[PDB]
Symmetry: C2
Subunit: 422 residues, 2 copies
């Protein structure tokens, strides 16, 4: 049987990429800015004309397990035929066991399941505030949260209120108060911010994602945790982009040996199949959310839970932390040896595991020529902040595939440089 979307699309006679871009332009809210993908499998996607590419954005680390992982799809399909949604107003035979699975895997007492990263962030801030008011006993409406410049956690009004990125906040106010912004990767600024006794939490990414793959100094996060703990301030660690093996370890916080007070997960939690996010913490923090104080229609639905248990298990069974660590060190090494020196407009090669970036001098080169050239050579990515090229493949990428992609990526940077010399 043809699905309704397929039958409906056939009647439109969208044959070329430009037909799809025109349909897009006419009917889709125009809040995004080259290719029309119809199929994905593992590390590979295919456009509507049958051309193959490596996906080096991977849902900005939502597709760590690869596109259309057969185990994840089987778990989806099996659960979807049985039960998808009950609400948390009724019990069911999936939510409990799934939260226990997550509790045991990440080492926490309680799991709050929500749907998106932004909801996980809001839920953590809410928990941190109510905890501050109720357990830490700080004055009513006075709770503060410390975040870092160039953070990204969502697009809610409150997320906009805690952004330093002009386009994220501009003309969406007035703003939620209670945020203090400091420099990333700066313990001094954190110590200084931590003198205010009304601070409920410090909310931080172990590597800043959308900010430009800003990898902090080794130990930064341990130091930050020590400072938070000595002031009775919760360390909220956002691993929505950096967790789940992406950096070579189950949590990017494992590098600095930090167990977050509140952990956020998302994205690859579902292998990019359905939106599910998680907030985890110890009992005396998470239990501030009493009945009726927080909710979500779809949060914890049995379909997402079944998908997430399968997705998480893929990470472990395919040993994807080891694969990210190994391949990623080889990637950065090749790019350093074959590009530093030969390509003067490369500012920095940086990353951990398979979360990598090449920042370029956008005064010396058009970054978009790198993007175009990459696509020409079978590599799809999208930079952040104009000038930071991102390289974020599915972790399941094979040794042969990764060698091949690395060659095409290097060849792309070199072809842009040769064209510049003329």
């Amino acid at each position: 049987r043809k699905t309704n979307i397929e039958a409906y699309r056939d009647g439109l006679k969208l044959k070329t990429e430009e037909d799809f871009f025109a349909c897009d332009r006419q009917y889709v809210c125009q809040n995004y800015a080259p290719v029309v993908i119809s199929k994905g499998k593992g590390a590979r996607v295919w456009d509507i004309n049958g051309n193959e590419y490596y996906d080096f954005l991977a849902g900005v680390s939502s597709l760590s397990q690869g596109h259309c992982h057969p185990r994840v799809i089987a778990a989806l399909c099996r659960q979807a035929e049985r039960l998808t949604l009950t609400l948390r107003a009724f019990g069911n035979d999936v939510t409990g066991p799934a939260c226990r699975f997550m509790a045991e895997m990440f080492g926490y007492d309680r799991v709050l399941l929500m749907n998106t990263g932004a909801e996980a962030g809001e839920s953590a801030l809410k928990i941190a505030r109510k905890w501050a008011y109720e357990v830490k006993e700080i004055p009513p409406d006075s709770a503060k949260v410390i975040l870092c410049n160039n953070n990204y956690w969502g697009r809610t009004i409150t997320a906009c209120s805690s952004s330093t990125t002009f386009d994220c906040y501009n003309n969406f106010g007035p703003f939620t108060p209670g945020f203090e912004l400091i420099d990333y990767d700066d313990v001094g600024a954190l110590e200084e911010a931590l003198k205010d006794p009304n601070v409920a939490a410090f909310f931080v990414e172990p590597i800043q994602g959308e900010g430009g793959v800003n990898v902090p100094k080794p130990g930064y996060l341990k130091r930050a945790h020590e400072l938070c703990r000595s002031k009775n301030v919760l360390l909220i660690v956002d691993e929505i982009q950096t967790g789940l093996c992406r950096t070579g370890r189950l949590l990017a916080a494992d590098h600095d040996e930090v167990h977050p007070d509140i952990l956020l997960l998302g994205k690859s939690l579902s292998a990019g199949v359905v939106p599910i996010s998680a907030v985890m913490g110890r009992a005396d923090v998470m239990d501030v959310l009493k009945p009726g104080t927080h909710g979500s229609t779809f949060g914890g639905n049995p379909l997402a839970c079944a998908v997430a248990v399968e997705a998480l298990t893929v990470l472990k069974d395919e040993k994807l932390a080891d694969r990210a660590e190994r391949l990623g060190a080889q990637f950065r090494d090749c790019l350093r040896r074959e590009l530093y020196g030969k390509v003067p407009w490369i500012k920095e090669i940086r990353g951990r595991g398979l979360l990598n970036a090449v920042e370029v001098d956008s005064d010396a080169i058009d970054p978009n020529d790198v993007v175009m050239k990459l696509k020409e050579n079978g590599i799809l990515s999208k930079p952040t902040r104009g000038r930071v090229m991102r390289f974020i493949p599915p972790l399941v990428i094979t040794d042969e595939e990764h060698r091949d992609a690395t060659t095409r990526i290097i060849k792309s940077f070199l072809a842009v440089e040769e064209e510049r010399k003329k």
Copy 2:
């Protein structure tokens, strides 16, 4: 071959046998932000669910109107499995062969120029608020940071900090501040109060439900929405109409706003947009409003993902193919008529039976009866629901409920209320 999926292997290894075993698992590992009816549902199909002990029930919450098409509608599940084999996520950073055609499908079905797909109701409300504000600053040219949005007391649109900031429900806001400013709360179903609030020129929008759901199935006087729209239009204020609960045939029309012949300036949809299969929401509006969201000013990882779009197109088509608007109008009018003729005369602690379509409620007097006795008795008679605000009993079945099931269910419901009354007389 034969094999377990991991959720099954793991659950099997925990050796959970009784409902108490599952209740205890939930209490230990799941954040305790709900007060659930004590049942452990295992299978859902159409209007029915079964628990782990085998007991069968009619689902009379239906995900609070997330499952209008029934549990596990075979067409929606087939569309889900088919698209999931092919492509589930690209981001809007890349094009794909589904997202644009799905937005076009919706734009044409609802009559709007532009469609924004988000994931949850809360995200749709946040996005609409962002649109109305930026539009106010850039098109209406009101002063920087001065935009106001009018909402109604007892509204419910989400649990973000900004939603908490615009709530009048104590447990939604308490100890979650400090709050997002820029909200002006008025009584629901009060034209005079809306009129006075609209005298402030910094008002960007009026954000309103055609029936308040979580607030208690509060059905306004007829014409209330039409009148709200005329007032908003005369002051160059956007009418944002939240149909996340009331939309998609639930009230006997495609949109509840259709009763008043209102076309919202911004329309919010969600919940049954996916037939309860995956979270997807939508914000729709005319080009000169929606186009304020320029590249880089708003986004979402999973918003408009191809899996969700294929499910939503299938879910929407089910509404039309099974004529669920007509089924809701008919069955709902019979339900309310039956309940009034069988319960009002006999049951003194029912204050009111109200609703539209198959969005119905029975408000009880909780100073006279423990509402939880009604919930328990319903369950014992094969009916699952959860009240809102302590004392508003909700009857919101899947619209696919058959005539025979609906009659059977209505008998069970009437018998439940009369039995609690019989205990009260004693």
